[PDB]
Design a protein around this nucleic acid. Structure first.
Lengths: 107, 108
DNA sequence: CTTTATGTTTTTCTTATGTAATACG
DNA sequence: CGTATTACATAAGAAAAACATAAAG
C-alpha cells in the first residue's frame, strides 16, 4: 500500500485508489493505469523511459500495441487524478524521455 | 526641435542631442542616426518599414549600401540613448517590418 | 562610415504529446 | 462497458531567418 501527495491512498495489488476527500469513493483503475502508477512509485521522482513503461505494462502477456495507447492512458490517469495539463502537480511529462513522478510519496 | 521622454532634447537641424542629466554634454549624431531619429519622430509610435528608413537615410545622395548598415545605425543610435535593447525605452524592433518609436515625444 | 565576423533573439517548420470522440471485444 | 485506435488540438523542439554588437578596413 502507498500514500501519495499526503492526499491519496493507493493499493496497487488491487488496482484501487482512494482520496481523503472521499473516504466513500474508491476509483477503479484499468490495469494499465494502475501498473503505470505502481512503477512510477517504486522509482519516485525519476524519469521513466517511455518504452520502459510500455514494456512493463503490456507484452509480458505478449501485447505489441501501438505507441499512442500509452499517451492516452496517461491522459486518462490525470483525468482520474484531476491533474491539470500544466501546471502538473503529480506527474510531469519529460519530453522525449518519458514520465516522472514528482508528488512526494509515503508508505 | 524635439523632446523625448522629457529627457533628451533633439535638434535635428544640427544633429545634436542633450540630456537633462547633462546640460553640458552635447552628443553629436552621425548624419544617418539623426535622420533615423527625425523620421521615427515625425511618425511616432508608427512602425517604419526597413526600406523607408534605408531610402530616406540614403540614396537621394545615391547610396546603395546593404541592410546591415541600417541595423548597425540602429545599434549605434540606441547606444547614444542608453536604450537597452531588451527591454527598450525608446526604439522597438518589429521583426521583418522595421523599427518603431515607442517614446513620449514633444516639439518646440 | 561601411562591411565583416561572431553572438543572440525571433519566426518558421517539424516533431511530441493531450485530449475528446468513435470503434470494438 | 472498459480498452484500443482515430481524429484533431496543443505543446515542445528543432532549424532557418532575422537582428544586435563587437572588430576590422
Amino acid at each position: 500500500k502507498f500514500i501519495l501527495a499526503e492526499k491519496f491512498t493507493f493499493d496497487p495489488l488491487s488496482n484501487t485508489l482512494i482520496d481523503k476527500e472521499d473516504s466513500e469513493e474508491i476509483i477503479r483503475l484499468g490495469s494499465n493505469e494502475s501498473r503505470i502508477l505502481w512503477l512510477l512509485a517504486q522509482r519516485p521522482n525519476e524519469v521513466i523511459s517511455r518504452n520502459d513503461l510500455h514494456d512493463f505494462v503490456w507484452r509480458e502477456q505478449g501485447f505489441e500495441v501501438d505507441d499512442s495507447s500509452l499517451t492516452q492512458a496517461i491522459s486518462t490517469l490525470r483525468k482520474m487524478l484531476k491533474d491539470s495539463t500544466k501546471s502538473p502537480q503529480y506527474v510531469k511529462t519529460v519530453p522525449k524521455r518519458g514520465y516522472q513522478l514528482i508528488a512526494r510519496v509515503e508508505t
